[PDB]
């Protein structure tokens, strides 16, 4: 994913060796930046992936499953299906 | 739109002063490139905008309205609503 992966590894390596919390501090500064429900999704998704990296599996498991159901409501399965397919992989 | 606008002025100015048809020649080379229905949309959209620029309003009017109905099927109104809102402006 283009902007997905541009911010993904950016806040990943900001915290993988930098501070875990300094990344999440600006993550909501980037998600408060988001203006659409399309935009308000990926930030929380990649935060799930973030906290997944730190071996915090089930804190954000709920964030995976709660959004796996927040998406099937609105036909994204025929409109970017992969996006939720890897969610289906990691819920 | 990021990739939308990256290719929008890319084939706009390829034809605005260059050849009108050389742009559309590679447009389907870019849309045959498209992998998903999400991807298969924007190319035909911007082709509508292309042929709109050349004062060919109603040839592609049908391409506007036929896709305005091909989208409401799948909940994009709560998932990138603007995208189809400007379609609503130009159908």
Author numbering:
A (entry chain A), B (entry chain B): 1 to 91
Q: What sentences appear in the manuscript?
A:
The type VI secretion system (T6SS) is a membrane‐anchored contractile nanomachine used by many Gram‐negative bacteria to deliver proteins from the cytosol directly to an extracellular space or across a target cell membrane. All TssA‐like proteins harbor a conserved ImpA_N domain (PF06812) located at the N‐terminal end, while the C‐terminal part differs in its composition. The Vibrio cholerae and P. aeruginosa TssA proteins TssAVC and TssA2PA with C‐terminal VasJ domain (Class A) facilitate sheath assembly initiation and polymerization by forming a stable dodecamer at the end of the sheath that is distal from the membrane anchor. Therefore, while potentially not being strictly essential, Class A TssAs act as chaperones assisting sheath‐tube copolymerization, which likely requires assistance in proper formation of the sheath hand‐shake domain (Ge et al, 2015; Kudryashev et al, 2015; Wang et al, 2017).
To further analyze the TssA of V. cholerae, we purified the protein and used cryo‐electron microscopy (cryo‐EM) to solve its structure. To test the symmetry, an initial 3D reference was built and refined without imposing any symmetry (C1), which resulted in clear six‐pointed star reconstruction. Further refinements have been done utilizing C6 symmetry. The outer and lumenal diameters are 132 and 53 Å, and the height of the assembly is 38 Å. Molecular weight estimation from the size‐exclusion chromatography (SEC) profile is ~600 kDa, which corresponds to twelve copies of TssAVC in one oligomer (634 kDa from sequence). The model built in cryo‐EM density of TssAVC is composed of twelve C‐terminal subunits (G376‐T466, helices α8–α12) tightly packed as two interpenetrating rings, similar to A. hydrophila TssA (TssAAH), but different from head‐to‐head stacked hexameric rings of the TssAEC assembly (Zoued et al, 2016; Dix et al, 2018). Each of the C‐terminal subunits forms two interfaces with its neighbors. The first 688 Å2 PISA‐predicted interface is based on three conserved residues (W454, E455, and P456) from α11–α12 linker of one subunit and helix α10 from the neighboring subunit. Second 672 Å2 interface forms a sixfold axis between helices α9–α11 of two neighboring subunits. Our reconstruction of TssAVC CTD fits as a rigid body with CC = 0.87 into the distal end of VipA‐N3 sheath mutant reconstruction.
